[PDB]
């Protein structure tokens, strides 16, 4: 029914790094063109653009639209942004999939984009301030990284899950180092070249082409991971090393009916067979994927043993390990090329980013069945099933 | 197929007025409760809450999820926000329709919220500011009022439409007072009492109940509308008198299959027969309603003559007339109880606000075929056709 | 040797009151003009202007020089500011007196000025702020009212003194009401008319002439005082009612040699016979006046008994009482026209402010020997002795 | 009668460089300790610390006092800051001299300190920001480098002087290069070691010791200067290269009567024979040292020809060439070790900074008579004559 005709993403950039000054809509713009040209479809053919974004502050009216306009998409089309936090970039893919199934559209471009570097500090000042200090609020931390119900960082929700499943520091660090090692394996082999479209950072001191994930750490040993201090709980287990990072990047994909694909002689990356989203307790948001992944598989009629490959968001090694333990899928088909702990996590784009990894890694190894899932801040989960054509 | 079990909106505050310090999701929580109470349907049964919101800076993670949790929707359910600007509120409703239509969900609460009053000031400050003055940005104007392509205010795009459709000062001023007269009337007549759900402003000075819109200016005369200066073009014609304002507010509707309402013994306010959205030159964004409505009507198999009522958002008396004159529809069924010019413009919510005034009026007067439509900064429109039983 | 030929002060404005948007150097300018006029001295004769100012942030380069230049003092002259906190306005006069004594200048305008209302919020942002919240600091509170070593407000050092001297809530409130009542009586009787020069607050819808000290409460009751809660210690004794206020104001004096005075035929307001400054423990800064007054008196060769009139700065009722008991002078000759609790406390100006009150009350009643004294945050005192010619 | 017993300054850091996060009173503290140590005088014997500072916003109550307390000066002492802009640090020495001359003190530590790096941005926000963007003001530029009467940068007053004296870009850039080469030679030779007291920048990740002036360019070229664009008038002459810099530092001298020094067996750095301050046209503030020096020499009874060494502040190549031109002293006794173009210009400290360089160079070369002099924004000059004992 609905295929993903084509994909693309920038490389994930380190916090205040390669894209320290790049607006999200501009990474979304480049990423939009990539899927247009990779599929040989013209921007004058895109009905609408759906883009996940969690930190829009200061970017101006409807960033999703600036990204489509800059991308070359004609004005007679439509564009919009959305936010289911970390799951945003993949929920957009499912939302675009729904515009087509209801016949409200032929061709959608869907994904997400985040610039955590460009997120401003804010303060409500209309009332004036007669006397005393006031706080300038970091929107990245407040709107993206802090639980609105329990008042603490997502790193604390990860300490909770850790306690639940009794995950030792050692095990988490092992997972963390494996992630970094698998990504360093995939980077130096070229398995990210395909899915990555280079981004040119226009500049005054001379242009700059960025086409490599800069967050990945090389020579990451168990030892280097064990010298780290806890980053949330002083007697805890969660560290900077065994947890995702703060990053910049974007990721989209082109959607059309399977028949449309055939009309244009296009060889899609996969068919979207099912998706699903379920809520859990914010205190243990890390558990999101389990109910989400099983719901998805149910709607697909698949068994967890039918999966050839899995991309499972690495918010924290803590929650990552506990999700694997329960679902029991072969941990040698999960995050084959490493995950967020190494690749980074530009929130709003992340769900569409691992979709990119999942799809291109299915094409090169010939896998037929794949799943992508992420935990979500505020206690949610989301998952999707892709089938190779 | 898909019906609106019920609906509810808060009263619309004045900028820095009655909801001066009320966070968006607070107004949303009340409204979510409101649709559930009015339909007699437990919170647990809600699958997902969908809310438009344009100004979320500083309000914390996924404000849509916050509205649901305070309203009492269980953690099991899911929530997310989205941003198609002025159409956001009406877009969540259709999207809520699609969740059910594609069988992914049974019961949806959709609508819009907006605290233009709580919207903060911001600046990017991570790269440092080595030397020299800088600007602290007003998020309300930056992300809500200013065109991201041509660098100017919505009022300047309303002016463009004026020059184009040769609309004059009088035609506009006549439209504004007629709108301020119809509203004041409807309010006195008690015509808003059913849709509005009272919000308590929990204060220290004393708990205040807000049960009426406060932007409605009584005794509006053309004489007083004429003593006004132009604030967009010195020698122009668009005045604060003939344009909507900055406003706070929230609105919503409970969605479910028509058979579902049936088995649940619920008498629905309408059925959503279709919807659409199209793009247009950003510089004349006020024309949005024109293609979008011609789109939605077609999908409904209706002729303009078939409509017995209409709700067309009152951004500016300029864009508004140009709509009325292009479609031809009978102006005396357009905005029977006043418009945003008189009522207010809580951006993200205006799409869900007008749906309410439409549905309760379609029911008060027994109209059969309705339609709500807005224009959207950036150059778009959203349309949707309603039908009672 | 050195005399005060003339003096003058603006009325003292309430916080964000009469001078809400009047920069301090404007108040200084009116006051420089008044002392010149009152003395029969031309601006072109002024060698140097010296002004205490504690909170100059944002006012531009050398506000002292701005006041002088706006006053018509010629470019050939010099001007500078200085900061010894609450003592600034008095110290500046001593410093002025020293330029003359060492033969370095003939004619000096000395005093201080302060707009607490115009003090800005601020933040260090040159290195950026990687991530996380940051405070916009209130320069008034930070640079004016907080101790730099122990981190608490001046009102806490007042508690410290209240415990040290065992001063009851009741004794302090009585002192509080007495100050207010004396000031109101002095105001109605016209006792402030001589010293005060009217200030014209320029407007567009009407200039306003301010010539009355607006911080003085009329008909103040002990009950209004007793009903207030401690403001610095939850089970404390210092309240907003028994403390000084935040205010705007300027005050100055024109110095020249006694012989230069005689040559001109001016009948001076007084001869400066000595001054002193001494440090104390920051924790109990309120006690600064004790050692300072004692050193000033010894330098003058006077006994405490020789004083006919005293002006001792009322930072807080607590410290004022402790100084009076410690020094032992008849309280009936101290702050005979009220003090800072009623009149207000423009930090940089206060020392000259109370010099003004001392001087005109001395001439009024024919008192031969006077003393002015203030406590200083950070733990210091300053005192000056004056004798009539 | 008054001698300089000892002197010290920190190295001068570059804008946001070695002292980027070091508060100014911390630099001052170190220098106070150094002069005490170098003289053989105990902290317990200090009566008063007087420190020039132009940018104290956000640093807390009376930074002069924080430095004295941090340095170990007893609480019974006193401390105050003052501001005559660029002249502050030298004036402070004259002022301390006057305390001793008038018999009010015996031992004074006087100088200046500045952290241009740590100066904050600011805004007046009490009245309330109605709606829309407001300016965050850079205190350094506003209160340090901008003229309060004509609105433009100090670099523009230098263009004024350039045109007036017809100084080419060539003569200025020649002066700029010569200043850098002299200071580099003096640094290489160790001529700054005597005056500099090392500073320890505390660091969680290590302590760094700063004992070299870091603004100084090594091997500066004529071509490096010639390349630059004028910074203040597009067809002008003054550039970043021929102008002084933005820097951090502190500097001081320890003062006592000649007779006191003799009692203690101290061999002083010099006798203070006279000082003078004089105003000029703000438009041409750079010319300030001309009348100040003449008046100082006239007060000392010296001919310009009697000077053996001279330190004349290098605000701008343009103004320094003019001063030398009108005064006519052998340029080969002026800034024998380079000046502020090379070494830097920490506003409040620079006047003591040049005092230090003159004092130690006088001692090494055996010069009998010397002069230090600075121009001052807003139109003033200060100078001081020193003779060897
Ligand atoms: O000794 C001279 C005086 O200071 C003035 O003449 C006096 O203060 C008057 O109030 C003038 O208005
Ligand atoms: O390292 C120590 C100092 O460089 C000297 O003691 C200095 O010359 C003093 O100022 C002497 O008065
Ligand atoms: O406008 C003033 C004159 O033109 C002179 O420049 C003046 O006497 C200055 O104070 C000295 O430079
Ligand atoms: O004593 C030697 C000095 O290095 C020179 O005097 C210096 O170069 C002059 O200031 C420029 O002519």
Which ranges in chain A belong to alpha helices (H)? 24-38, 63-71, 88-101, 139-140, 154-165, 169-187, 222-226, 258-263, 289-300, 317-327, 340-343, 347-365
Q: Whose CA is nearest to atom 12 of ligand 1?
A: C38
Q: Running DSSP on this structure, what letter comes out for residue D285?
A: G
Q: Do C126 and B125 touch (CB under 8 A)?
A: no
Closest CA to D308 of D276, D333, D272, D345: D333
Residue B122 bears catalytic tag:
no
Closest CA to D120 of C20, B125, C54: B125
Give dist(CA C15, CA C57) in Å, integer: 17
> Distances in Å between the alpha carbon of D154 and those of C168, D2, D249, D284, D312?
56, 34, 20, 9, 17
Q: Running DSSP on this structure, what letter comes out for residue D146?
A: B
Smallest Cβ–Cβ distance between D129 and the set A125, A130, A131 belongs to: A125
Give dist(CA B112, CA B105) in Å, integer: 19
Resolution value, angstrom units? 2.3
Give dist(CA A185, CA A218) in Å, integer: 9
- Tell how far CA B110 is from the center of its chain: 12
Render the burial of C259-283: b for 16+ CB within 10 Å, e for the rest. Answer: ebbeeeebebbbbbbbbbbbbbebb
> Distances in Å between the alpha carbon of D267 and those of A372, C139, D259?
81, 44, 11
CA-based nearest residue in chain C for residue A17: C130
Ligand 4: nearest atom to the Cα of D365: 1
Q: Whose CA is nearest to atom 4 of ligand 4?
A: D336
| Touching B: A residues 285-314, CB under 8 Å | none
Residue B375 bears catalytic tag:
yes
- Evaluate whether A1-121+191-272 and A149-190+273-386 have a shared fold: yes
CA-based nearest residue in chain A for residue B382: A78
Exposed (0-12), middle (13-18) or buried (19+): which is C40, by Cβ within 10 Å?
exposed
Give the pairing type, strands A108-115 and A48-52.
parallel
Question: Facing residues of B110 across strands?
Answer: B50, B253
Q: Just give the CATH number of A149-190+273-386.
A: 3.40.47.10
Question: Facing residues of D256 across strands?
Answer: D3
Residues of chain D in contact with residue C379, where contact means CB-CB under 8 angstroms, are: 75
Residues of chain B in contact with residue C128, where contact means CB-CB under 8 angstroms, are: 125-129
Distance of CA D348 from the midpoint of ligand 2 (Å): 22
- Of D6, D35, D193, D256, which is best to mutate to test ligand 2, by the most ligand atoms within 8 angstroms of its C-beta? D6
Closest CA to C300 of C333, C332, C273, C327: C273
Active site residues per annotation of D: 86, 345, 375
* Coil vs helix vs strand at C179: helix
At D313, phi and psi to the nearest 5?
-45, 130
Q: Do B278 and A76 touch (CB under 8 A)?
A: yes
Distance of CA D284 from the midpoint of ligand 3 (Å): 7
The DSSP annotation for D174-206 comes to HHHHHHHHHHHHHHHHTTTTTTB--EEE--TT-
Give the pairing type, strands A369-376 and A380-387.
antiparallel
Q: Running DSSP on this structure, what letter comes out for residue D304?
A: G
Exposed (0-12), middle (13-18) or buried (19+): which is A309, by Cβ within 10 Å?
buried
Q: Do B76 and A280 touch (CB under 8 A)?
A: yes
Q: Whose CA is nearest to atom 9 of ligand 4?
A: D332
SS (H, E, C) chain B: CEEEEEEEECCCEECCCCCCCCCHHHHHHHHHHHHHHHHCCCHHHCCEEEEECCCCCCCCCCHHHHHHHHHCCCCCCEEEEEECHHHHHHHHHHHHHHHHHCCCCCEEEEEEEEECCCCCEEECCCCCCCCCCEEEEEHHHHHHCECCCCCCEHHHHHHHHHHHCCCCHHHHHHHHHHHHHHHHHHHHHCCCCCCECCEEECCCCCCEEECCCCCCCCCCCHHHHHCCCECCCCCCCCEHHHECCCEEEEEEEEEEEHHHHHHCCCCCCEEEEEEEEEECCHHHHHHCHHHHHHHHHHHHCCCHHHCCCEEECCCEHHHHHHHHHHHCCCHHHECCCCCHHHHCCCHHHHHHHHHHHHHHHHHHCCCCECCEEEEECCCEEEEEEEECC
Q: Do D123 and B130 touch (CB under 8 A)?
A: no
Closest CA to C383 of C323, C318, C337, C305: C323
| Touching C: B residues 118-147, CB under 8 Å | 125-131
Is residue C71 in contact with ligand 1, taking CB distance under 6 Å? no
Q: Whose CA is nearest to atom 12 of ligand 4?
A: D332
CA dihedral C122, C125, C131, C133 (to 10 degrees): 0
Is residue C194 in contact with ligand 1, taking CB distance under 6 Å? yes
The full set of domain ranges for chain C reads 1-121+191-272, 149-190+273-386
Q: Do D61 and C277 touch (CB under 8 A)?
A: no
Q: Do D131 and A126 touch (CB under 8 A)?
A: yes
Smallest Cβ–Cβ distance between A85 and the set B61, B102, B139 belongs to: B61
Q: Where is C188: in which H helix or E strand?
A: helix C169-188
The neighbour count for residue D134, using CB atoms within 10 Å, is: 17
Exposed (0-12), middle (13-18) or buried (19+): which is B18, by Cβ within 10 Å?
buried
- Of D32, D38, D270, D358, which is best to mutate to test ligand 2, by the most ligand atoms within 8 angstroms of its C-beta? D38
CA-based nearest residue in chain C for residue A15: C130
* Coil vs helix vs strand at D242: coil
Q: Which ligand lies nearest to the CA atom of residue D324 in the structure?
A: 4
> Distances in Å between the alpha carbon of A219 and those of A15, A125, A180, C304?
21, 48, 8, 80
The number of CA neighbours under 13 Å toward the Cβ of B149 is 20
How was this model experimentally determined? Answer: X-ray
CATH topology of domain D1-121+191-272: Peroxisomal Thiolase; Chain A, domain 1 (3.40.47)
Residues of chain A in contact with residue D133, where contact means CB-CB under 8 angstroms, are: none
Distance of CA D195 from the midpoint of ligand 2 (Å): 7
* Coil vs helix vs strand at A65: helix
* Coil vs helix vs strand at A76: coil
At D151, phi and psi to the nearest 5?
85, -15
Ligand 1: nearest atom to the Cα of C6: 4
Give dist(CA B254, CA B4) in Å, integer: 6
Residues of chain C in contact with residue A140, where contact means CB-CB under 8 angstroms, are: 131
> Distances in Å between the alpha carbon of D325 and those of B245, C221, D275, D320?
65, 71, 21, 8
The neighbour count for residue B332, using CB atoms within 10 Å, is: 7
């Amino acid at each position: 029914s609905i295929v993903i005709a084509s994909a693309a993403r920038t490389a994930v950039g380190s916090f205040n790094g390669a894209f320290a000054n790049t607006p999200a809509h501009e990474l979304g713009a480049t990423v939009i063109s990539a899927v247009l040209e990779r599929a040989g479809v013209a921007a004058g053919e895109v009905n609408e653009v759906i883009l996940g974004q969690v930190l829009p502050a200061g970017e101006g009216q409807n960033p999703a639209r600036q990204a489509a306009m800059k991308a070359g998409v004609p004005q007679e089309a439509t564009a919009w942004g959305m936010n289911q936090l970390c799951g945003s970039g993949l929920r957009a893919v499912a939302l675009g999939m729904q515009q087509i199934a209801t016949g409200d559209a032929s061709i959608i471009v869907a994904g997400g984009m985040e610039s955590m570097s460009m997120a401003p500090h804010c303060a409500h000042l209309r009332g004036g301030v007669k006397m005393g200090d006031f706080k300038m609020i970091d929107t990245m931390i407040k709107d993206g990284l802090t639980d609105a119900f329990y008042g603490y960082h997502m790193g604390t929700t990860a300490e909770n899950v850790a306690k639940q499943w009794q995950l030792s520091r050692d095990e988490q660090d092992a997972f963390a180092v494996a992630s970094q090692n698998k990504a360093e394996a995939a980077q130096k082999d070229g398995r990210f070249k395909d899915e990555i479209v280079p981004f040119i950072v226009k500049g005054r001191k001379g242009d700059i082409t960025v086409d490599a994930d800069e967050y990945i750490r090389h020579g990451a040993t168990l030892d280097s991971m064990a010298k780290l201090r806890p980053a949330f709980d002083k007697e805890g287990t969660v560290t900077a090393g065994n947890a995702s990072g703060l990053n910049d990047g974007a990721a989209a994909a082109l959607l059309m009916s399977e028949a449309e694909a055939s009309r244009r002689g296009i060889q899609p990356l996969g068919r979207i067979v099912s998706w699903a989203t379920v809520g859990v307790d914010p205190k243990v948001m890390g558990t999101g994927p389990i109910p989400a992944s099983r719901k998805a598989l149910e709607r697909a009629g698949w068994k967890i043993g039918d999966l050839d490959l899995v991309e499972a968001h690495e918010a924290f090694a803590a929650q990552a390990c506990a999700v694997n333990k329960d679902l029991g899928w072969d941990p040698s088909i999960v995050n084959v090329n490493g995950g967020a702990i190494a690749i980074g996590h530009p929130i709003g784009a992340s769900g569409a980013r691992i979709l990119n990894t999942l799809l291109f890694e299915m094409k090169r190894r010939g896998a037929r069945k794949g799943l992508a899932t992420l935990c979500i801040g505020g206690g949610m989960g989301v998952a999707m099933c892709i089938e190779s054509l």
